């Protein structure tokens, strides 16, 4: 079982914005999660070949990862904050769908998600 193409991070005809909320999602949210000791499994698309997870992309039909999110934020791919928040939530949910409760990777996702929730709680009002 092979890897799919990664999610796109560039699409010139998709309209985009740089908003204060999106800036916060990069400068505070992504940066906080990216530097965490448990970030590493989430910094790039899951390589199902190297990890010997041939069923991964049979089960996970909407892959997402922080490498992709980082590129989307840096390349101003998004129209609004909700699109980016959805990407983080997709990433966490994929982990919980694929893995078993208590697995290391689930504990890692939970630690990142707790921080994510704390930061999104203080998402600034749109300017
Ligand atoms: O990119 C990766 N390199 C690794 O060794 C892993 C990985 C695989 C199994 C357990 C743990 Cl804690 C990490 C990655 N990421 C990953 C990210 C989410 C997942 O659900 C799974 Cl199974 C793996």
Swiss-Prot record:
There is a cross-link at residue 58 (Glycyl lysine isopeptide (Lys-Gly) (interchain with G-Cter in SUMO2)). The record marks 99 as: Acetylated histone binding. Phosphorylation by CK2 disrupt the intramolecular binding between the bromo domain 2 and the NPS region and promotes binding between the NPS and the BID regions, leading to activate the protein and promote binding to acetylated histones. In absence of phosphorylation, BRD4 does not localize to p53/TP53 target gene promoters, phosphorylation promoting recruitment to p53/TP53 target promoters. It is found in: Nucleus; Chromosome. Residues 17-123 form the Bromo domain. JQ1, a thieno-triazolo-1,4-diazepine derivative, and I-BET, a benzodiazepine derivative, have been tested on tumors with success. Treatment with GSK1210151A (I-BET151, a I-BET derivative) has strong effets on mixed lineage leukemia and promotes myeloid differentiation and leukemia stem-cell depletion. It is linked to Cornelia de Lange syndrome 6: A form of Cornelia de Lange syndrome, a clinically heterogeneous developmental disorder associated with malformations affecting multiple systems. It is characterized by facial dysmorphisms, abnormal hands and feet, growth delay, cognitive retardation, hirsutism, gastroesophageal dysfunction and cardiac, ophthalmologic and genitourinary anomalies. CDLS6 inheritance is autosomal dominant. A chromosomal aberration involving BRD4 is found in a rare, aggressive, and lethal carcinoma arising in midline organs of young people. Translocation t(15;19)(q14;p13) with NUTM1 which produces a BRD4-NUTM1 fusion protein. The NET domain mediates interaction with a number of chromatin proteins involved in transcription regulation (NSD3, JMJD6, CHD4, GLTSCR1 and ATAD5). Interacts with p53/TP53; the interaction is direct. Interacts (via CTD region) with CDK9 and CCNT1, acting as an associated component of P-TEFb complex. Interacts with RELA (when acetylated at 'Lys-310'). Interacts (via NET domain) with NSD3, CHD4, BICRA and ATAD5. The interaction with BICRA bridges BRD4 to the GBAF complex. Interacts (via NET domain) with JMJD6 (via JmjC and N-terminal domains); the interaction is stronger in presence of ssRNA and recruits JMJD6 on distal enhancers. Interacts with NSD3. Interacts with NIPBL. (Microbial infection) Interacts with bovine papillomavirus type 1 regulatory protein E2. This interactions may serve for the tethering of viral genomes to host mitotic chromosomes allowing successful partitioning of the viral genome during cell division. This is Bromodomain-containing protein 4. The gene is BRD4.
């Amino acid at each position: 079982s092979m890897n799919p193409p990664p999610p796109e991070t560039s699409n010139p005809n998709k309209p985009k914005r740089q908003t204060n909320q999106l800036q916060y999602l990069l400068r505070v949210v992504l940066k906080t999660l990216w530097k965490h000791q448990f970030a590493w499994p989430f910094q790039q698309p899951v390589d199902a070949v190297k990890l010997n997870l041939p069923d991964y992309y049979k089960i996970i039909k909407t892959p997402m990862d922080m490498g992709t999110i980082k590129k989307r934020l840096e390349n101003n791919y998004y129209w609004n904050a909700q699109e980016c928040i959805q990407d983080f939530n997709t990433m966490f949910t994929n982990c919980y769908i694929y893995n078993k409760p208590g697995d290391d990777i689930v504990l890692m996702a939970e630690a990142l998600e707790k921080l994510f929730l704390q930061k999104i709680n203080e998402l600034p009002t749109e300017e």
